[PDB]
Amino acid sequence: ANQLAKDLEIMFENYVEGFEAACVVSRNAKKFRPGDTAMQRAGDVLYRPQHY
Amino acid sequence: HMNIEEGLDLSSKTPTALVQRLVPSVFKEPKNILYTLDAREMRDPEHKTEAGRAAGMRLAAQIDSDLISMVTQRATNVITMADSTAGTQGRDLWNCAAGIDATMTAIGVPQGINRRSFWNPFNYKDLAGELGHRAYAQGATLTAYEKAQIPPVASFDSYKTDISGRLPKGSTESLTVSGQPEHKVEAKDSNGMPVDNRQGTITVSASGLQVGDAFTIAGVNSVHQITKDTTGQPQVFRVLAVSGTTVTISPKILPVENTDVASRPYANVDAKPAESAAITILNKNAAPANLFWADGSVELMYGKLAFPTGQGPQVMTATTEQGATLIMSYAFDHIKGVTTARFTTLYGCSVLVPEYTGIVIAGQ
Amino acid sequence: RAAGMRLAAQIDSDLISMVTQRATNVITMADSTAGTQGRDLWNCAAGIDATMTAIGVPQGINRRSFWNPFNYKDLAGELGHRAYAQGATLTAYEKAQIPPVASFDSYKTDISGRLPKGSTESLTVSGQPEHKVEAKDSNGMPVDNRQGTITVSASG
Amino acid sequence: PQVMTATTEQGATLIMSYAFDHIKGVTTARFTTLYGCSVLVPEYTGIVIAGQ
């Protein structure tokens, strides 16, 4: 019969596949946690000595 | 995708507009085969038997041919090589297949998801000809020599496809992009229907381009889809429709620092075209494509029409070798003295992520 | 989900561009017209370790290499197209993975850093420059001894 | 605002914060991170470029 109702089939959490970053270089880097109070007093810079 | 913002105080910065992009997947018009037998012809039962056999396999083979044509036309990563006059054929194809995966990796397609390659019989032979002629005649070398089979290649599982898609012979004209086209991203249009963000439209200085072309624009390079850092490789665009100087292409030209702020998170490329930027058509010669994908982008969706049993015709179903439903219907008109036979199937083929797919063409 | 991963990916991009700008051992090769691709990249990687050794970087400490996807592919192509199609050759042919290279562990990086197109001018160092080591400057702030300043004749 | 903490793939700190403005009925949301990257000894690092 003529004049049937139509709607939208939207699958609201069936995402199509999507891109990523592997992060591999920064996952392999050495990590360091300086003290946040010290970094504030220092103005977000710190220094380390070199050998003689 | 989201913008990055700099500093502690953000009171001057616009928040990233969320854009709920949707991609359509749609059934084609139904695919059918019709034949008829009269009441004299039906005295020999081989005609129904052989025509039914022929109809069933011809619809199965069309699902494959439609999908192969679809993937060949939509795939956005494209690499070309001339056929080698030296011994380097097959090595140059391995370098091209690995170049597709290197490009997929550089744009940010996941590295851990499974990968498939479908080689036309000539370029599958070119790979087997390299691997079979290695100086240690054992194992994979000996299989490649004796039976022309190859193991996986360049991180792809390797398949030989008897049918393959062909790119056209590209134009010899010095085409250029007119204006500086720069597409926006939208969730839905002015009628409130979802917008397909995989396609956009450009103007070109003369009507030389063809459906299925692959081309690059002089100043335009792909970016990593998350960080938006340049790959340093040209972005390839696929022609999907033509109308004089107006051409529909895939993907959209979405720059980093797009004039539309809301689409900047969705950038594909490092810049928009310069004024009068040159078009380089990659498919200089017509050639059979070799198809590559990372899994989850390329799909067949299957339907079934509601053909009723027990009224009028007699109706039956079968399954193709790809899992598609066939409906077989037979109806006899006793005034005409004829049986009409209908074989029918309903499906759609789609490439949900044109970046998860690529093609290699040899012969330049 | 989108915001968490976009921030994580920026940390990688900033590190990669930092290391690219600051690294002082550099080796370059023309892209090979012969079959010597992959061999030439191995000569460069082994030249980096030989240089690190010759300046006195400890030989015992662990070593890492991060290859852009195109040059990782060039090494995999060389190793996979060898005559004995078994073991490491077969892995490099089938799946494009490579072993450690020239004492470095080998990693494929999806994002990579870039150097600009260098000037074609015939530049020269002006004066006869010679730096000195300092603990602190004339205002008493620390001096970064990793860097110094020179004059060059034509600004390219 | 509501304030929460998470960790990236590399071990970096994410701060997530949400502020609801009830007379206009909106939540603004912020994700933020603080880091530095450094080469402490340039001589311990090198690069290779092809294409000369």
Side-chain angles (χ1 to χ4, degrees), chain B residues 243-277:
Chain B
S243 182
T245 52
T246 297
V247 183
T248 297
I249 68 163
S250 182
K252 279 190 151 185
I253 298 172
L254 302 177
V256 183
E257 70 163 24
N258 196 326
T259 311
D260 174 60
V261 177
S263 58
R264 292 181 182 186
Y266 302 102
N268 288 324
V269 302
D270 63 341
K272 69 184 182 184
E275 195 66 50
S276 305

PDB file of all heavy atoms in Angstrom, chain B residues 243-277:
ATOM      1  N   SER B 243      30.997  15.998 -13.747  1.00  0.00           N
ATOM      2  CA  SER B 243      30.005  16.836 -14.421  1.00  0.00           C
ATOM      3  C   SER B 243      30.692  18.075 -15.006  1.00  0.00           C
ATOM      4  O   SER B 243      30.880  19.085 -14.330  1.00  0.00           O
ATOM      5  CB  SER B 243      28.904  17.210 -13.424  1.00  0.00           C
ATOM      6  OG  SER B 243      27.900  17.985 -14.053  1.00  0.00           O
ATOM      7  N   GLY B 244      31.153  17.990 -16.255  1.00  0.00           N
ATOM      8  CA  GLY B 244      31.949  19.055 -16.869  1.00  0.00           C
ATOM      9  C   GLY B 244      33.238  19.311 -16.087  1.00  0.00           C
ATOM     10  O   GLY B 244      34.012  18.385 -15.848  1.00  0.00           O
ATOM     11  N   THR B 245      33.474  20.555 -15.677  1.00  0.00           N
ATOM     12  CA  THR B 245      34.584  20.960 -14.795  1.00  0.00           C
ATOM     13  C   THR B 245      34.361  20.647 -13.313  1.00  0.00           C
ATOM     14  O   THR B 245      35.280  20.818 -12.520  1.00  0.00           O
ATOM     15  CB  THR B 245      34.834  22.466 -14.926  1.00  0.00           C
ATOM     16  OG1 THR B 245      33.620  23.160 -14.744  1.00  0.00           O
ATOM     17  CG2 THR B 245      35.404  22.832 -16.290  1.00  0.00           C
ATOM     18  N   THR B 246      33.181  20.191 -12.896  1.00  0.00           N
ATOM     19  CA  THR B 246      32.871  19.910 -11.486  1.00  0.00           C
ATOM     20  C   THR B 246      33.032  18.423 -11.206  1.00  0.00           C
ATOM     21  O   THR B 246      32.466  17.591 -11.904  1.00  0.00           O
ATOM     22  CB  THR B 246      31.456  20.380 -11.145  1.00  0.00           C
ATOM     23  OG1 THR B 246      31.383  21.779 -11.315  1.00  0.00           O
ATOM     24  CG2 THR B 246      31.064  20.096  -9.702  1.00  0.00           C
ATOM     25  N   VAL B 247      33.822  18.070 -10.195  1.00  0.00           N
ATOM     26  CA  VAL B 247      34.263  16.693  -9.941  1.00  0.00           C
ATOM     27  C   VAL B 247      34.067  16.336  -8.478  1.00  0.00           C
ATOM     28  O   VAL B 247      34.458  17.093  -7.598  1.00  0.00           O
ATOM     29  CB  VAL B 247      35.736  16.522 -10.354  1.00  0.00           C
ATOM     30  CG1 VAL B 247      36.212  15.084 -10.166  1.00  0.00           C
ATOM     31  CG2 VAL B 247      35.960  16.879 -11.823  1.00  0.00           C
ATOM     32  N   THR B 248      33.517  15.164  -8.193  1.00  0.00           N
ATOM     33  CA  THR B 248      33.354  14.661  -6.828  1.00  0.00           C
ATOM     34  C   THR B 248      34.481  13.700  -6.516  1.00  0.00           C
ATOM     35  O   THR B 248      34.762  12.790  -7.293  1.00  0.00           O
ATOM     36  CB  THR B 248      31.999  13.990  -6.636  1.00  0.00           C
ATOM     37  OG1 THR B 248      30.988  14.951  -6.829  1.00  0.00           O
ATOM     38  CG2 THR B 248      31.793  13.396  -5.247  1.00  0.00           C
ATOM     39  N   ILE B 249      35.130  13.900  -5.377  1.00  0.00           N
ATOM     40  CA  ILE B 249      36.379  13.263  -4.990  1.00  0.00           C
ATOM     41  C   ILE B 249      36.285  12.680  -3.587  1.00  0.00           C
ATOM     42  O   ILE B 249      35.437  13.076  -2.794  1.00  0.00           O
ATOM     43  CB  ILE B 249      37.568  14.234  -5.129  1.00  0.00           C
ATOM     44  CG1 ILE B 249      37.528  15.393  -4.115  1.00  0.00           C
ATOM     45  CG2 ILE B 249      37.661  14.758  -6.567  1.00  0.00           C
ATOM     46  CD1 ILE B 249      38.869  16.114  -3.961  1.00  0.00           C
ATOM     47  N   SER B 250      37.166  11.744  -3.266  1.00  0.00           N
ATOM     48  CA  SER B 250      37.331  11.188  -1.927  1.00  0.00           C
ATOM     49  C   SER B 250      38.817  11.066  -1.574  1.00  0.00           C
ATOM     50  O   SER B 250      39.585  10.682  -2.453  1.00  0.00           O
ATOM     51  CB  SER B 250      36.634   9.835  -1.881  1.00  0.00           C
ATOM     52  OG  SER B 250      36.713   9.254  -0.600  1.00  0.00           O
ATOM     53  N   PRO B 251      39.263  11.367  -0.343  1.00  0.00           N
ATOM     54  CA  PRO B 251      38.493  11.940   0.758  1.00  0.00           C
ATOM     55  C   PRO B 251      38.156  13.424   0.521  1.00  0.00           C
ATOM     56  O   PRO B 251      38.521  13.996  -0.501  1.00  0.00           O
ATOM     57  CB  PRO B 251      39.410  11.745   1.964  1.00  0.00           C
ATOM     58  CG  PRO B 251      40.799  11.955   1.383  1.00  0.00           C
ATOM     59  CD  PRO B 251      40.669  11.280   0.026  1.00  0.00           C
ATOM     60  N   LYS B 252      37.475  14.072   1.471  1.00  0.00           N
ATOM     61  CA  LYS B 252      37.363  15.539   1.498  1.00  0.00           C
ATOM     62  C   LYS B 252      38.735  16.201   1.674  1.00  0.00           C
ATOM     63  O   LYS B 252      39.576  15.708   2.428  1.00  0.00           O
ATOM     64  CB  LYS B 252      36.406  15.986   2.620  1.00  0.00           C
ATOM     65  CG  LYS B 252      34.930  15.893   2.227  1.00  0.00           C
ATOM     66  CD  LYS B 252      33.985  16.557   3.247  1.00  0.00           C
ATOM     67  CE  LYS B 252      32.724  17.064   2.527  1.00  0.00           C
ATOM     68  NZ  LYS B 252      31.792  17.834   3.395  1.00  0.00           N
ATOM     69  N   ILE B 253      38.936  17.367   1.067  1.00  0.00           N
ATOM     70  CA  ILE B 253      40.088  18.236   1.332  1.00  0.00           C
ATOM     71  C   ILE B 253      39.836  18.961   2.650  1.00  0.00           C
ATOM     72  O   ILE B 253      39.190  20.000   2.675  1.00  0.00           O
ATOM     73  CB  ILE B 253      40.342  19.219   0.169  1.00  0.00           C
ATOM     74  CG1 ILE B 253      40.680  18.447  -1.120  1.00  0.00           C
ATOM     75  CG2 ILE B 253      41.499  20.174   0.517  1.00  0.00           C
ATOM     76  CD1 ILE B 253      40.767  19.319  -2.372  1.00  0.00           C
ATOM     77  N   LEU B 254      40.312  18.400   3.756  1.00  0.00           N
ATOM     78  CA  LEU B 254      40.189  18.973   5.097  1.00  0.00           C
ATOM     79  C   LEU B 254      41.573  19.377   5.609  1.00  0.00           C
ATOM     80  O   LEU B 254      42.317  18.500   6.046  1.00  0.00           O
ATOM     81  CB  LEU B 254      39.515  17.951   6.034  1.00  0.00           C
ATOM     82  CG  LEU B 254      38.133  17.466   5.596  1.00  0.00           C
ATOM     83  CD1 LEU B 254      37.613  16.420   6.562  1.00  0.00           C
ATOM     84  CD2 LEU B 254      37.134  18.607   5.534  1.00  0.00           C
ATOM     85  N   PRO B 255      41.972  20.653   5.526  1.00  0.00           N
ATOM     86  CA  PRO B 255      43.291  21.078   5.957  1.00  0.00           C
ATOM     87  C   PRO B 255      43.439  21.123   7.473  1.00  0.00           C
ATOM     88  O   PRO B 255      42.492  21.419   8.198  1.00  0.00           O
ATOM     89  CB  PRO B 255      43.498  22.476   5.377  1.00  0.00           C
ATOM     90  CG  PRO B 255      42.480  22.558   4.256  1.00  0.00           C
ATOM     91  CD  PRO B 255      41.336  21.726   4.798  1.00  0.00           C
ATOM     92  N   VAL B 256      44.661  20.956   7.963  1.00  0.00           N
ATOM     93  CA  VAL B 256      45.054  21.567   9.239  1.00  0.00           C
ATOM     94  C   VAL B 256      44.926  23.082   9.075  1.00  0.00           C
ATOM     95  O   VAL B 256      45.226  23.610   8.010  1.00  0.00           O
ATOM     96  CB  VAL B 256      46.479  21.163   9.642  1.00  0.00           C
ATOM     97  CG1 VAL B 256      46.862  21.743  11.001  1.00  0.00           C
ATOM     98  CG2 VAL B 256      46.596  19.642   9.746  1.00  0.00           C
ATOM     99  N   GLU B 257      44.415  23.780  10.087  1.00  0.00           N
ATOM    100  CA  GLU B 257      44.021  25.197   9.995  1.00  0.00           C
ATOM    101  C   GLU B 257      43.043  25.520   8.842  1.00  0.00           C
ATOM    102  O   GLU B 257      43.111  26.573   8.213  1.00  0.00           O
ATOM    103  CB  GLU B 257      45.208  26.166  10.170  1.00  0.00           C
ATOM    104  CG  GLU B 257      46.247  26.228   9.039  1.00  0.00           C
ATOM    105  CD  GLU B 257      47.140  27.477   9.099  1.00  0.00           C
ATOM    106  OE1 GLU B 257      47.309  28.077  10.187  1.00  0.00           O
ATOM    107  OE2 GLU B 257      47.703  27.861   8.047  1.00  0.00           O
ATOM    108  N   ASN B 258      42.068  24.629   8.627  1.00  0.00           N
ATOM    109  CA  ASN B 258      40.851  24.882   7.847  1.00  0.00           C
ATOM    110  C   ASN B 258      40.177  26.207   8.244  1.00  0.00           C
ATOM    111  O   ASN B 258      40.084  26.522   9.429  1.00  0.00           O
ATOM    112  CB  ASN B 258      39.885  23.708   8.093  1.00  0.00           C
ATOM    113  CG  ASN B 258      38.757  23.608   7.085  1.00  0.00           C
ATOM    114  OD1 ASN B 258      38.238  24.586   6.580  1.00  0.00           O
ATOM    115  ND2 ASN B 258      38.370  22.405   6.747  1.00  0.00           N
ATOM    116  N   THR B 259      39.647  26.974   7.299  1.00  0.00           N
ATOM    117  CA  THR B 259      38.879  28.199   7.581  1.00  0.00           C
ATOM    118  C   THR B 259      37.630  27.931   8.423  1.00  0.00           C
ATOM    119  O   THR B 259      37.230  28.772   9.219  1.00  0.00           O
ATOM    120  CB  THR B 259      38.460  28.883   6.277  1.00  0.00           C
ATOM    121  OG1 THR B 259      39.563  28.991   5.417  1.00  0.00           O
ATOM    122  CG2 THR B 259      37.927  30.295   6.488  1.00  0.00           C
ATOM    123  N   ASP B 260      37.024  26.752   8.301  1.00  0.00           N
ATOM    124  CA  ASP B 260      35.975  26.287   9.207  1.00  0.00           C
ATOM    125  C   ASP B 260      36.575  25.689  10.490  1.00  0.00           C
ATOM    126  O   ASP B 260      37.117  24.585  10.477  1.00  0.00           O
ATOM    127  CB  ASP B 260      35.115  25.255   8.478  1.00  0.00           C
ATOM    128  CG  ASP B 260      34.110  24.630   9.441  1.00  0.00           C
ATOM    129  OD1 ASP B 260      33.282  25.380   9.996  1.00  0.00           O
ATOM    130  OD2 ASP B 260      34.187  23.406   9.654  1.00  0.00           O
ATOM    131  N   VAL B 261      36.464  26.389  11.619  1.00  0.00           N
ATOM    132  CA  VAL B 261      37.085  25.965  12.882  1.00  0.00           C
ATOM    133  C   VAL B 261      36.577  24.601  13.347  1.00  0.00           C
ATOM    134  O   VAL B 261      37.373  23.763  13.761  1.00  0.00           O
ATOM    135  CB  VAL B 261      36.890  27.033  13.970  1.00  0.00           C
ATOM    136  CG1 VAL B 261      37.462  26.608  15.321  1.00  0.00           C
ATOM    137  CG2 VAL B 261      37.579  28.338  13.569  1.00  0.00           C
ATOM    138  N   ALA B 262      35.277  24.331  13.229  1.00  0.00           N
ATOM    139  CA  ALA B 262      34.675  23.093  13.723  1.00  0.00           C
ATOM    140  C   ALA B 262      35.219  21.824  13.053  1.00  0.00           C
ATOM    141  O   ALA B 262      35.198  20.758  13.662  1.00  0.00           O
ATOM    142  CB  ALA B 262      33.162  23.190  13.540  1.00  0.00           C
ATOM    143  N   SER B 263      35.728  21.910  11.823  1.00  0.00           N
ATOM    144  CA  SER B 263      36.291  20.770  11.099  1.00  0.00           C
ATOM    145  C   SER B 263      37.799  20.602  11.238  1.00  0.00           C
ATOM    146  O   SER B 263      38.312  19.566  10.823  1.00  0.00           O
ATOM    147  CB  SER B 263      35.894  20.813   9.632  1.00  0.00           C
ATOM    148  OG  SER B 263      36.313  22.005   9.042  1.00  0.00           O
ATOM    149  N   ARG B 264      38.526  21.523  11.881  1.00  0.00           N
ATOM    150  CA  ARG B 264      39.979  21.393  12.110  1.00  0.00           C
ATOM    151  C   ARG B 264      40.402  20.094  12.806  1.00  0.00           C
ATOM    152  O   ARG B 264      41.395  19.513  12.375  1.00  0.00           O
ATOM    153  CB  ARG B 264      40.517  22.598  12.888  1.00  0.00           C
ATOM    154  CG  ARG B 264      40.470  23.871  12.050  1.00  0.00           C
ATOM    155  CD  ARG B 264      41.028  25.045  12.845  1.00  0.00           C
ATOM    156  NE  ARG B 264      40.933  26.267  12.046  1.00  0.00           N
ATOM    157  CZ  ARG B 264      41.409  27.455  12.343  1.00  0.00           C
ATOM    158  NH1 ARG B 264      42.033  27.690  13.451  1.00  0.00           N
ATOM    159  NH2 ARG B 264      41.262  28.423  11.499  1.00  0.00           N
ATOM    160  N   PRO B 265      39.669  19.544  13.789  1.00  0.00           N
ATOM    161  CA  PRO B 265      40.006  18.243  14.359  1.00  0.00           C
ATOM    162  C   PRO B 265      39.962  17.097  13.353  1.00  0.00           C
ATOM    163  O   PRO B 265      40.622  16.091  13.549  1.00  0.00           O
ATOM    164  CB  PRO B 265      38.991  18.002  15.469  1.00  0.00           C
ATOM    165  CG  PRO B 265      38.530  19.394  15.854  1.00  0.00           C
ATOM    166  CD  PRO B 265      38.557  20.122  14.521  1.00  0.00           C
ATOM    167  N   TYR B 266      39.229  17.240  12.254  1.00  0.00           N
ATOM    168  CA  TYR B 266      39.015  16.206  11.246  1.00  0.00           C
ATOM    169  C   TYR B 266      39.930  16.363  10.026  1.00  0.00           C
ATOM    170  O   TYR B 266      39.698  15.741   9.000  1.00  0.00           O
ATOM    171  CB  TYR B 266      37.526  16.157  10.903  1.00  0.00           C
ATOM    172  CG  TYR B 266      36.678  15.894  12.128  1.00  0.00           C
ATOM    173  CD1 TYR B 266      35.995  16.943  12.760  1.00  0.00           C
ATOM    174  CD2 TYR B 266      36.675  14.616  12.703  1.00  0.00           C
ATOM    175  CE1 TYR B 266      35.350  16.731  13.987  1.00  0.00           C
ATOM    176  CE2 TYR B 266      36.007  14.390  13.918  1.00  0.00           C
ATOM    177  CZ  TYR B 266      35.362  15.452  14.572  1.00  0.00           C
ATOM    178  OH  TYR B 266      34.830  15.258  15.801  1.00  0.00           O
ATOM    179  N   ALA B 267      40.993  17.167  10.121  1.00  0.00           N
ATOM    180  CA  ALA B 267      41.934  17.378   9.031  1.00  0.00           C
ATOM    181  C   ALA B 267      42.547  16.074   8.487  1.00  0.00           C
ATOM    182  O   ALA B 267      43.027  15.248   9.263  1.00  0.00           O
ATOM    183  CB  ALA B 267      43.021  18.340   9.507  1.00  0.00           C
ATOM    184  N   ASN B 268      42.567  15.937   7.158  1.00  0.00           N
ATOM    185  CA  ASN B 268      43.234  14.884   6.382  1.00  0.00           C
ATOM    186  C   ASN B 268      44.607  15.302   5.857  1.00  0.00           C
ATOM    187  O   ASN B 268      45.438  14.442   5.579  1.00  0.00           O
ATOM    188  CB  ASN B 268      42.365  14.530   5.161  1.00  0.00           C
ATOM    189  CG  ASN B 268      41.119  13.770   5.521  1.00  0.00           C
ATOM    190  OD1 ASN B 268      41.120  12.950   6.421  1.00  0.00           O
ATOM    191  ND2 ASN B 268      40.029  14.012   4.834  1.00  0.00           N
ATOM    192  N   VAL B 269      44.839  16.603   5.661  1.00  0.00           N
ATOM    193  CA  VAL B 269      45.958  17.107   4.858  1.00  0.00           C
ATOM    194  C   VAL B 269      46.604  18.334   5.475  1.00  0.00           C
ATOM    195  O   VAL B 269      45.981  19.048   6.250  1.00  0.00           O
ATOM    196  CB  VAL B 269      45.555  17.386   3.401  1.00  0.00           C
ATOM    197  CG1 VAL B 269      44.999  16.139   2.723  1.00  0.00           C
ATOM    198  CG2 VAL B 269      44.533  18.511   3.234  1.00  0.00           C
ATOM    199  N   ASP B 270      47.861  18.594   5.148  1.00  0.00           N
ATOM    200  CA  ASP B 270      48.637  19.671   5.758  1.00  0.00           C
ATOM    201  C   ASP B 270      48.199  21.080   5.331  1.00  0.00           C
ATOM    202  O   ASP B 270      48.325  22.013   6.118  1.00  0.00           O
ATOM    203  CB  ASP B 270      50.137  19.460   5.501  1.00  0.00           C
ATOM    204  CG  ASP B 270      50.585  19.501   4.031  1.00  0.00           C
ATOM    205  OD1 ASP B 270      49.738  19.345   3.128  1.00  0.00           O
ATOM    206  OD2 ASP B 270      51.808  19.634   3.799  1.00  0.00           O
ATOM    207  N   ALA B 271      47.673  21.255   4.122  1.00  0.00           N
ATOM    208  CA  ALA B 271      47.217  22.538   3.595  1.00  0.00           C
ATOM    209  C   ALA B 271      46.130  22.350   2.527  1.00  0.00           C
ATOM    210  O   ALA B 271      46.024  21.281   1.928  1.00  0.00           O
ATOM    211  CB  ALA B 271      48.422  23.284   3.019  1.00  0.00           C
ATOM    212  N   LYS B 272      45.330  23.388   2.259  1.00  0.00           N
ATOM    213  CA  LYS B 272      44.483  23.444   1.056  1.00  0.00           C
ATOM    214  C   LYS B 272      45.346  23.666  -0.197  1.00  0.00           C
ATOM    215  O   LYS B 272      46.463  24.176  -0.067  1.00  0.00           O
ATOM    216  CB  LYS B 272      43.389  24.518   1.202  1.00  0.00           C
ATOM    217  CG  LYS B 272      43.912  25.956   1.196  1.00  0.00           C
ATOM    218  CD  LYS B 272      42.786  26.960   1.455  1.00  0.00           C
ATOM    219  CE  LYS B 272      43.362  28.375   1.387  1.00  0.00           C
ATOM    220  NZ  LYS B 272      42.354  29.410   1.727  1.00  0.00           N
ATOM    221  N   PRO B 273      44.864  23.338  -1.406  1.00  0.00           N
ATOM    222  CA  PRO B 273      45.577  23.628  -2.643  1.00  0.00           C
ATOM    223  C   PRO B 273      45.939  25.108  -2.783  1.00  0.00           C
ATOM    224  O   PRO B 273      45.146  25.976  -2.430  1.00  0.00           O
ATOM    225  CB  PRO B 273      44.641  23.191  -3.768  1.00  0.00           C
ATOM    226  CG  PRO B 273      43.804  22.099  -3.120  1.00  0.00           C
ATOM    227  CD  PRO B 273      43.644  22.610  -1.698  1.00  0.00           C
ATOM    228  N   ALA B 274      47.108  25.403  -3.345  1.00  0.00           N
ATOM    229  CA  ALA B 274      47.430  26.745  -3.816  1.00  0.00           C
ATOM    230  C   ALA B 274      46.542  27.142  -5.008  1.00  0.00           C
ATOM    231  O   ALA B 274      45.910  26.296  -5.640  1.00  0.00           O
ATOM    232  CB  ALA B 274      48.914  26.780  -4.190  1.00  0.00           C
ATOM    233  N   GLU B 275      46.507  28.426  -5.359  1.00  0.00           N
ATOM    234  CA  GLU B 275      45.766  28.876  -6.539  1.00  0.00           C
ATOM    235  C   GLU B 275      46.302  28.200  -7.814  1.00  0.00           C
ATOM    236  O   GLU B 275      47.510  28.189  -8.051  1.00  0.00           O
ATOM    237  CB  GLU B 275      45.849  30.404  -6.655  1.00  0.00           C
ATOM    238  CG  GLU B 275      44.816  30.975  -7.634  1.00  0.00           C
ATOM    239  CD  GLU B 275      43.371  30.775  -7.145  1.00  0.00           C
ATOM    240  OE1 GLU B 275      43.083  31.107  -5.973  1.00  0.00           O
ATOM    241  OE2 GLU B 275      42.527  30.302  -7.936  1.00  0.00           O
ATOM    242  N   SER B 276      45.415  27.633  -8.636  1.00  0.00           N
ATOM    243  CA  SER B 276      45.768  26.909  -9.867  1.00  0.00           C
ATOM    244  C   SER B 276      46.691  25.697  -9.664  1.00  0.00           C
ATOM    245  O   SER B 276      47.433  25.338 -10.577  1.00  0.00           O
ATOM    246  CB  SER B 276      46.307  27.862 -10.944  1.00  0.00           C
ATOM    247  OG  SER B 276      45.386  28.907 -11.195  1.00  0.00           O
ATOM    248  N   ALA B 277      46.675  25.047  -8.499  1.00  0.00           N
ATOM    249  CA  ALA B 277      47.558  23.918  -8.203  1.00  0.00           C
ATOM    250  C   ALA B 277      47.432  22.774  -9.222  1.00  0.00           C
ATOM    251  O   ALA B 277      46.327  22.365  -9.577  1.00  0.00           O
ATOM    252  CB  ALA B 277      47.261  23.410  -6.792  1.00  0.00           C
TER     253      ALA B 277
END
